[PDB]
Amino acid sequence: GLRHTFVVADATLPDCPLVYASEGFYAMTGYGPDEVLGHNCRFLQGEGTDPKEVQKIRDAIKKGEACSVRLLNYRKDGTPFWNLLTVTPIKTPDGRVSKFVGVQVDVTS
């Protein structure tokens, strides 16, 4: 299939830090687990990232609904790539959101 990555965000903490990321996420972004785990994914953003699309993610996270946006992210070396982000809320049996899982595809073509 297509080349994608995978991360898990812990919604029980107020800012949804990352608790697990697939090896492709580390290889794609240039960042390692010692600089990714425990942080919000927004470190990938930079100057050309649209504050409108970023707002669609923030609202969906606060509302506990899924979202799919096209962002401009930056590797550790500062080079830009285009990220097709899709975040999905994972809820407990009582309806509360516990984790946020996101698939990231580099659609720079």
Encoded one letter per residue, x for contact with ligand FMN by CB under 6 A and - for no contact, window 16-55 reads x-----------------------xxx-xx--------x-
Question: Which tokens sit at 47?
Answer: 């100057």
Locate all alpha helices (DSSP H) within the chain, ordered by sequence.
23-29, 33-36, 51-63
Residues 6+ apart with CB under 8 A from 62: none
Q: Based on CB atoms, which residue is closest to ligand FMN, 26 or 54? A: 54
* Residue 58 vs 63, nearer CB to ligand FMN: 58
Length of the chain equals 109
Residue of closest CB approach to ligand FMN = 102
Is residue 15 exposed (0-12), middle (13-18) or buried (19+ Cβ within 10 Å)?
A: exposed
The radius of gyration of the chain from alpha carbons, rounded to an integer in Å, stands at: 13
> Is 41 annotated as a binding-site member?
yes
63 near ligand FMN, rule: CB under 6 A: no
Residue ranges that bind ligand FMN, judged by CB under 6 A = 7, 9, 16, 40-42, 44-45, 54, 57-58, 61, 71, 73, 83, 85, 87, 100-102, 104
Residues at the binding site are 40-45, 58, 73, 83, 104
